[PDB]
Amino acid sequence: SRRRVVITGMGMLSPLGLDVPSSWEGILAGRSGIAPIEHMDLSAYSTRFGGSVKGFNVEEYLSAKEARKLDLFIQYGLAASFQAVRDSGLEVTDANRERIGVSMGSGIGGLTNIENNCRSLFEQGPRRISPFFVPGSIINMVSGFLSIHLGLQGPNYALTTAQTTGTHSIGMAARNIAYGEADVMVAGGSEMAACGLGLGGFGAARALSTRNDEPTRASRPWDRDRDGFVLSDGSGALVLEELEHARARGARIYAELVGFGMSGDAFHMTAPPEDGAGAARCMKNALRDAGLDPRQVDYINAHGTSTPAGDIAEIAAVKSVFGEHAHALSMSSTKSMTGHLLGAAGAVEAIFSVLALRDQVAPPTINLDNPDEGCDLDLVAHEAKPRKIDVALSNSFGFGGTNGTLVFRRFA
Amino acid sequence: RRRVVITGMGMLSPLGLDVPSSWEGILAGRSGIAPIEHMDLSAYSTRFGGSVKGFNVEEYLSAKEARKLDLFIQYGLAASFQAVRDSGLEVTDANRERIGVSMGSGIGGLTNIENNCRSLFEQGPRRISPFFVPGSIINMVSGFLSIHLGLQGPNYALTTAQTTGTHSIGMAARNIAYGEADVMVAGGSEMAACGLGLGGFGAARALSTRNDEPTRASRPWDRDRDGFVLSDGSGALVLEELEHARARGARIYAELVGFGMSGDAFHMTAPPEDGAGAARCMKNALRDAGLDPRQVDYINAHGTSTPAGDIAEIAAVKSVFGEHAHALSMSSTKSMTGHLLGAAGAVEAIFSVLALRDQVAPPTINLDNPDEGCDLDLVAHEAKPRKIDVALSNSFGFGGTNGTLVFRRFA
Numbered sequence: 082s083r084r085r086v087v088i089t090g091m092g093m094l095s096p097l098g099l100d101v102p103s104s105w106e107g108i109l110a111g112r113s114g115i116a117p118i119e120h121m122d123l124s125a126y127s128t129r130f131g132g133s134v135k136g137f138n139v140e141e142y143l144s145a146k147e148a149r150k151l152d153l154f155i156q157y158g159l160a161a162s163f164q165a166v167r168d169s170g171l172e173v174t175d176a177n178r179e180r181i182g183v184s185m186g187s188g189i190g191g192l193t194n195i196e197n198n199c200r201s202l203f204e205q206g207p208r209r210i211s212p213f214f215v216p217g218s219i220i221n222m223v224s225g226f227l228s229i230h231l232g233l234q235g236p237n238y239a240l241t242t243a244q245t246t247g248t249h250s251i252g253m254a255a256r257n258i259a260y261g262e263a264d265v266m267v268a269g270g271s272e273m274a275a276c277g278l279g280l281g282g283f284g285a286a287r288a289l290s291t292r293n294d295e296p297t298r299a300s301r302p303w304d305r306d307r308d309g310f311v312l313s314d315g316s317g318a319l320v321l322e323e324l325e326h327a328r329a330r331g332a333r334i335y336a337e338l339v340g341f342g343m344s345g346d347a348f349h350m351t352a353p354p355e356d357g358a359g360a361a362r363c364m365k366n367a368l369r370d371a372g373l374d375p376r377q378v379d380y381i382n383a384h385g386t387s388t389p390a391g392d393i394a395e396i397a398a399v400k401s402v403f404g405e406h407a408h409a410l411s412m413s414s415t416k417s418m419t420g421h422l423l424g425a426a427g428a429v430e431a432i433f434s435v436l437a438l439r440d441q442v443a444p445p446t447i448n449l450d451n452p453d454e455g456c457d458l459d460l461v462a463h464e465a466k467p468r469k470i471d472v473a474l475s476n477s478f479g480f481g482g483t484n485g486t487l488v489f490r491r492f493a
Numbered sequence: 494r495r496r497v498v499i500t501g502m503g504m505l506s507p508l509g510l511d512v513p514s515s516w517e518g519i520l521a522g523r524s525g526i527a528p529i530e531h532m533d534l535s536a537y538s539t540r541f542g543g544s545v546k547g548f549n550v551e552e553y554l555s556a557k558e559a560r561k562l563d564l565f566i567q568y569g570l571a572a573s574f575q576a577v578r579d580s581g582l583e584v585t586d587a588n589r590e591r592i593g594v595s596m597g598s599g600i601g602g603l604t605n606i607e608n609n610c611r612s613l614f615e616q617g618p619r620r621i622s623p624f625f626v627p628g629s630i631i632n633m634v635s636g637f638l639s640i641h642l643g644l645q646g647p648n649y650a651l652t653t654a655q656t657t658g659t660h661s662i663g664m665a666a667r668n669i670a671y672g673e674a675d676v677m678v679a680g681g682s683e684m685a686a687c688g689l690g691l692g693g694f695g696a697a698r699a700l701s702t703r704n705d706e707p708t709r710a711s712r713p714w715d716r717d718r719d720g721f722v723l724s725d726g727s728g729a730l731v732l733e734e735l736e737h738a739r740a741r742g743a744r745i746y747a748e749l750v751g752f753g754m755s756g757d758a759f760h761m762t763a764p765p766e767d768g769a770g771a772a773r774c775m776k777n778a779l780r781d782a783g784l785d786p787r788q789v790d791y792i793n794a795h796g797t798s799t800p801a802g803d804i805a806e807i808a809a810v811k812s813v814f815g816e817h818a819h820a821l822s823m824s825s826t827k828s829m830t831g832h833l834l835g836a837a838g839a840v841e842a843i844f845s846v847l848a849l850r851d852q853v854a855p856p857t858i859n860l861d862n863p864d865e866g867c868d869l870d871l872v873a874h875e876a877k878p879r880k881i882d883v884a885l886s887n888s889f890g891f892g893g894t895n896g897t898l899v900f901r902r903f904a
């Protein structure tokens with residue numbers, strides 16, 4: 082029936098680093114990747130900081146010429162994907178290229194490119210719109226360009242489920258493998274929404290922290306003084322592989338992907354229900370998918386965005402799903418350090434969950450100085466905590482009330 | 494693996510504001526293409542397209558709700574509401590966890606982004622709508638539909654450019670087949686007819702510039718074709734597990750038996766001349782369905798009226814079907830509707846289902862002089878009544894992303 086799926090390669094760009102090891106080093110050290118934004122003038126904006134990718138060199142991956150045609154979200158997605166494939170040791174050949182697919186998504190996609198082309202249109206006229214505008218801006222072009230560059234001929238698609246994108250991308254890619262549509266998938270997400278429209282759009286909704294004087298303290302999930310999320314950029318990609326395929330080529334296996342859950346809240350467009358009912362159904366779906374007792378869960382990488390309503394909803398959802406075991410597991414939000422990578426959040430957080438398994442350590446929730454009312458679980462405040470972790474869960478919730486949960490397990 | 498049937502359909506297209514009106518146009522060989530009226534294209538090289546005419550969002554949403562939502566979302570919701578109504582499905586506490594949605598778009602909220610860009614550049618960030626982000630992102634058709642109807646099953650959105658509608662329907666069917674849902678609303682929507690859209694595709698020289706005869710512009714496989722015609726709209730299907738459908742006495746249009754995907758891994762905006770990726774995709778879909786290629790009677794082609802694209806599809810069909818390529822009928826309804834981009838696969842799935850219901854191959858209009866090698870039965874000019882037990886619908890998109898759906902008569 083259903084085939085087993087393992088993780089054999091990972092890649093990342095984040096506010097903490099230009100690859101996985103550097104990012105993870107920052108995570109375990111409790112380092113913030115958040116700083117005043119330097120690439121544009123935000124004097125007129127209520128939020129002037131976020132998580133930028135620092136010192137990205139696209140020329141390690143693509144020619145300058147090729148890169149100029151592509152929005153940053155595509156460049157970031159390609160970088161993460163190339164890293165992951167290299168990390169996997171996979172060799173693409175005529176014998177396997179039809180069995181290797183890609184599903185790299187984004188929540189917002191090419192907003193910066195669209196903005197720049199809109200500026201050209203309004204100020205100069207339609208003949209200043211780039212000939213590469215459409216292919217350089219649409220969300221499926223990470224999958225498109227990766228497939229072209231590596232020669233991948235398997236299932237080729239992209240999800241866009243807002244802040245849940247990365248999680249859904251990885252889960253659905255795993256389903257393709259489990260049900261025999263592919264043997265390998267490169268999956269994850271990328272995001273670069275740090276332009277006027279992005280900061281201004283989230284600003285207009287009053288969704289962002291406005292702690293401009295102390296950006297590194299802004300993202301503080303479950304803390305009583307939290308005041309909205311921190312906008313961040315980057316990408317995560319995983320090479321998912323059928324177990325026997327991985328074993329046959331002597332691949333290094335990080336972990337097994339054992340469970341995937343989805344649900345819809347059917348509640349509100351931008352706010353979760355206070356009781357976290359949809360998130361609870363999603364996690365339960367994922368645990369039953371994995372054939373697990375909830376007591377087997379050791380670590381949860383929370384969605385944990387540093388919003389008042391969101392953070393408390395997750396606590397409620399975890400208490401509902403896990404009962405008294407909610408007090409035995411460890412749960413943390415790495416968004417405390419990275420900020421919120423939107424569509425890429427689930428991808429980078431899947432990577433962190435896998436590394437939590439590899440290194441047997443719960444990443445910290447930094448800035449958790451004063452836990453809010455009811456936020457009385459082990460939230461790994463301040464410092465990384467070495468502990469036994471056999472099963473790790475990663476949650477993402479997004480606009481439209483779209484939920485995703487991934488369950489990873491140590492592989493023996 | 495559980496069987497999946499189609500129990501409801503909905504549509505907005507250049508030919509009509511619902512399925513029956515659109516299908517009437519298709520069978521009559523009507524063009525939905527006309528000079529664009531909603532903006533000033535005097536300075537553009539292409540000034541026509543397929544618009545949705547006389548859309549009344551207040552049949553579906555309050556004025557307040559509508560003001561928050563980009564047109565592509567309005568179109569998607571309209572098609573979705575129609576399809577759910579057409580299905581007769583009753584959502585209850587007992588089944589709401591088993592009903593999901595996967596409605597996608599290729600480009601999404603270009604018009605809304607354009608309008609907000611004006612506020613940003615002329616006034617600054619403080620004039621950006623508080624609803625800008627949720628009202629513009631692609632997953633909001635799925636989001637809003639789930640909220641309005643109380644659907645708590647799988648909730649997601651595909652964005653695979655011109656293949657979106659096809660992939661959305663295919664992956665939704667997989668959810669049902671493998672037990673993740675009993676019902677899914679699936680398809681796509683698009684409204685890219687703004688300065689950025691016309692200007693963007695214009696800058697790439699991808700559009701027909703036959704401004705003097707807009708209804709003759711979309712001419713798939715014709716020697717005088719000169720690019721695609723940009724169109725707007727939406728399609729949605731209610732997909733349902735067979736026993737679930739039977740239990741409530743649903744009207745079943747057809748069965749969805751196969752879904753294939755592939756990547757060309759060739760070029761960003763052009764397929765390979767031999768259509769190798771499309772061929773692999775169709776073969777995958779047929780194997781998924783457990784069908785011999787000789788069982789295929791009708792193909793609703795991607796058929797965009799681009800030089801490279803059209804010929805690649807013929808080559809792919811010849812490769813997959815061999816001598817049977819001369820027995821089947823293939824047509825492009827884009828000859829009449831133009832190219833609905835992300836919604837193309839959704840409306841074309843609907844047309845394939847209706848081809849099965851009515852036992853008729855829709856025409857490829859404007860096919861006056863077939864190009865070299867385009868010597869299959871392309872149903873030139875007029876609808877052709879024939880036996881159709883199995884119908885295939887193809888979509889190919891930027892990045893070389895391919896999808897094929899296989900539908901069969903349900904007895």
Ligand SMILES: O=C(O)[C@@H]1CS[C@@H](c2cccs2)N1
Pocket residue numbers: 244310346349350351352353354386388391421478479480481482483
């Ligand atoms: O990631 C985020 O910042 C947002 C806010 S918390 C979550 C939602 C759940 C339901 C609607 S919005 N997504």
Ligand SMILES: O=C(O)[C@@H]1CS[C@@H](c2cccs2)N1
Pocket residue numbers: 655721757760761762763764765797799802832889890891892893894
């Ligand atoms: O739908 C369209 O108009 C375009 C052109 S034909 C198809 C492609 C296949 C491979 C890359 S582009 N998509």
Ligand SMILES: [Mg+2]
Pocket residue numbers: 112113114115296297298299300417418419420
């Ligand atoms: Mg921080």
